[PDB]
Amino acid sequence: SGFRKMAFPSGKVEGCMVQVTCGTTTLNGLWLDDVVYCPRHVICTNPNYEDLLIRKSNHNFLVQAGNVQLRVIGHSMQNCVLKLKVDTANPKTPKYKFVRIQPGQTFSVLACYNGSPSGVYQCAMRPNFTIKGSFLNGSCGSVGFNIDYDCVSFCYMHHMELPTGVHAGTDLEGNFYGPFVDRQTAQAAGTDTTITVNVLAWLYAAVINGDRWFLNRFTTTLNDFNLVAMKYNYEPLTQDHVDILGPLSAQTGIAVLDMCASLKELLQNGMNGRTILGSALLEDEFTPFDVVRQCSGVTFQ
Amino acid sequence: SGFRKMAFPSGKVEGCMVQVTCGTTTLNGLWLDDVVYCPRHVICTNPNYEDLLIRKSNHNFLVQAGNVQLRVIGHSMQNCVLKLKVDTANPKTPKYKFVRIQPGQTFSVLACYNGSPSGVYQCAMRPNFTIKGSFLNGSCGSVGFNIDYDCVSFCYMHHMELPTGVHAGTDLEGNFYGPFVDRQTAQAAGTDTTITVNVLAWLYAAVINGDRWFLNRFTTTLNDFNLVAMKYNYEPLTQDHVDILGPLSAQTGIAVLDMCASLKELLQNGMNGRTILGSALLEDEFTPFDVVRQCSGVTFQ
Ligand SMILES: *CCC(=O)N(CCC(N)=O)NC(=O)[C@H](CC(C)C)NC(=O)[C@@H](NC(=O)OCc1ccccc1)C(C)C
Numbered sequence: 001s002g003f004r005k006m007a008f009p010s011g012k013v014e015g016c017m018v019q020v021t022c023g024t025t026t027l028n029g030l031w032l033d034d035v036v037y038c039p040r041h042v043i044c045t046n047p048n049y050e051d052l053l054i055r056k057s058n059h060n061f062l063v064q065a066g067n068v069q070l071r072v073i074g075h076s077m078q079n080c081v082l083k084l085k086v087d088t089a090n091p092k093t094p095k096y097k098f099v100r101i102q103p104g105q106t107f108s109v110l111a112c113y114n115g116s117p118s119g120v121y122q123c124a125m126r127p128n129f130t131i132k133g134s135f136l137n138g139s140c141g142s143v144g145f146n147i148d149y150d151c152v153s154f155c156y157m158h159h160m161e162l163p164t165g166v167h168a169g170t171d172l173e174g175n176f177y178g179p180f181v182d183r184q185t186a187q188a189a190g191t192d193t194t195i196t197v198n199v200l201a202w203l204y205a206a207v208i209n210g211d212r213w214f215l216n217r218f219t220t221t222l223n224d225f226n227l228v229a230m231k232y233n234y235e236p237l238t239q240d241h242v243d244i245l246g247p248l249s250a251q252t253g254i255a256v257l258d259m260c261a262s263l264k265e266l267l268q269n270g271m272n273g274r275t276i277l278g279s280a281l282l283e284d285e286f287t288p289f290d291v292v293r294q295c296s297g298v299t300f301q
Numbered sequence: 302s303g304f305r306k307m308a309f310p311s312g313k314v315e316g317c318m319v320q321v322t323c324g325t326t327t328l329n330g331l332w333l334d335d336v337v338y339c340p341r342h343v344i345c346t347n348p349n350y351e352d353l354l355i356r357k358s359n360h361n362f363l364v365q366a367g368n369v370q371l372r373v374i375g376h377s378m379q380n381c382v383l384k385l386k387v388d389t390a391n392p393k394t395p396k397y398k399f400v401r402i403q404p405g406q407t408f409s410v411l412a413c414y415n416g417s418p419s420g421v422y423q424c425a426m427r428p429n430f431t432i433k434g435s436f437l438n439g440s441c442g443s444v445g446f447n448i449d450y451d452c453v454s455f456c457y458m459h460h461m462e463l464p465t466g467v468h469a470g471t472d473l474e475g476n477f478y479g480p481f482v483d484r485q486t487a488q489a490a491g492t493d494t495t496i497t498v499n500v501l502a503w504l505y506a507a508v509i510n511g512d513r514w515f516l517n518r519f520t521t522t523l524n525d526f527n528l529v530a531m532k533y534n535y536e537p538l539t540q541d542h543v544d545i546l547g548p549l550s551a552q553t554g555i556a557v558l559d560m561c562a563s564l565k566e567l568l569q570n571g572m573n574g575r576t577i578l579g580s581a582l583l584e585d586e587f588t589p590f591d592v593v594r595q596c597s598g599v600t601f602q
């Protein structure tokens with residue numbers, strides 16, 4: 001027992017991280033097979049990146065993999081990522097896929113500086129397509145991922161920090177999550193919501209772990225719950241959401257709509273001093289899969 | 302910016318994890334050079350472990366390192382750990398040290414099942430020598446660690462779960478943290494406290510990240526603060542604690558005793574609906590070093 005914001009082991013990703021330097025810009029690069037993927041704003045000197053990239057050579061790009069020079073033999077822009085063809089394949093390349101995630105889904109971030117792993121932490125993709133990350137200068141190029149047995153599902157690469165301290169990047173094809181662009185404009189995250197199905201998943205994590213004080217005798221229809229959800233800036237709850245909670249429902253014996261009734265009183269009455277899994281807030285950054293994995297015993301290799 | 306419960310990259314530890322099986326017990330083993338360290342209750346069949354270990358052979362112990370058999374050529378008890386001498390050194394052994402930590406200090410846990418990494422998360426050693434971990438059956442043998450440049454400071458190996466859902470283990474010499482033993486008795490964690498210097502470190506993390514609403518014009522002496530600390534089951538604050546916060550003090554310009562005054566009103570008045578770094582609680586599982594590392598940019602390799 002216990003419940004913790006837990007990341008995937010980072011070792012498979014640590015082996016793909018590299019330092020890309022061209023001009024006076026240094027950022028992080030992701031090395032898979034013979035390509036280094038990195039943010040295109042590593043390119044020298046409002047920008048017309050196609051224009052600025054024709055102006056570059058291969059030798060402009062200094063790729064450090066630990067202590068080893070990586071000779072770039074080609075380059076190419078893919079949306080907002082750069083793809084640097086190097087003469088050596090990464091012998092540590094894990095099995096991988098580039099998969100775009102939905103808001104509501106979570107991933108682990110390996111924050112990196114100068115191609116060196118710094119820390120690992122778990123995030124979710126916010127309804128407004130930002131992420132509440134932890135990133136300093138030089139962190140761009142650091143990737144978000146999930147593991148599924150032995151396969152690394154790369155889903156995010158980090159690009160910029162928005163004025164609210166939240167973070168914006170792209171999937172690994174260079175397509176930004178959300179209405180964000182890799183320049184300097186007055187960009188701001190849009191109004192965010194709470195991920196209802198994630199909060200419900202976490203209430204089931206609380207019940208699996210013996211926290212039951214918020215449980216209750218009441219029930220409610222889907223439509224009535226949803227009337228209280230929007231009132232509190234919570235995402236609508238769909239029937240699929242309810243089916244995805246089925247396993248947690250059936251394991252704890254609490255009907256999904258019954259757990260909704262409890263979320264209703266929690267939203268309407270607050271938490272009256274108590275805590276749920278050591279939190280005084282309704283946590284929304286655990287999916288039903290995260291809960292089932294942490295409270296069943298699933299591994300990865 | 303941002304502030305997140307961040308772990309060290311786990312890759313260096315992932316490479317040391319192995320599955321130890323003897324009898325019908327399977328747990329996790331830590332493979333460094335030619336020794337596998339593991340909890341001694343892997344031993345077969347209230348126990349007199351010296352008695353039960355003379356009754357074992359080397360071949361009793363099945364060590365799996367991924368897909369590879371590891372031949373045990375010797376064994377030995379060290380307090381509550383077992384040391385299994387194997388015929389092959391771990392070529393992935395990082396530079397390491399076995400260091401015992403103090404309550405108040407933090408570490409990253411690589412939870413493992415059957416010798417396979419499952420997740421990584423950040424913990425602290427509670428004042429009562431437990432840890433609020435996240436562990437299921439078969440997790441014992443999983444280690445806690447810190448990284449310092451390239452060196453892995455192993456500090457914890459996990460052994461058991463206490464009735465409150467909190468966790469107890471040993472440093473890597475087999476000496477338990479706290480008055481806990483590796484058998485089945487009516488053991489229970491003792492009354493815990495809050496790590497004051499850690500909460501103050503986190504208030505500075507909040508101020509470094511733009512959360513300032515709890516700041517205030519007031520000051521207080523050390524003795525007066527400590528009168529309010531004990532009243533709220535908070536650890537006493539020593540002068541050394543204040544010196545260890547010096548850098549955070551000097552970086553934000555807020556005197557340590559001034560930050561104490563703010564912690565006083567927070568304890569006495571609560572948080573009045575607001576949140577600090579996205580928490581509705583006063584967090585105590587970040588040390589001053591954790592804050593400085595996350596809000597300066599430090600890496601490890
Ligand atoms: C690649 C460098 C890096 O490490 N970045 C991540 C920084 C972080 N803390 O997440 N990325 C940047 O520093 C980028 C570099 C550009 C070439 C993309 N710049 C930023 O993220 C700035 N943010 C920003 O400009 O957002 C748009 C904006 C501009 C003006 C007013 C409001 C919003 C940030 C200030 C460093």
Ligand SMILES: *CCC(=O)N(CCC(N)=O)NC(=O)[C@H](CC(C)C)NC(=O)[C@@H](NC(=O)OCc1ccccc1)C(C)C
Pocket residue numbers: 001328340342436437438439440441442460461462463464468483484485486487488489
């Ligand atoms: C090594 C097996 C393992 O995975 N463990 C970690 C379990 C966990 N969730 O952290 N360890 C155990 O299961 C140990 C095995 C013993 C051989 C050490 N057992 C426990 O942790 C039990 N806890 C326990 O007995 O605590 C003492 C106690 C006994 C009776 C009443 C109150 C307290 C636990 C019930 C599995």
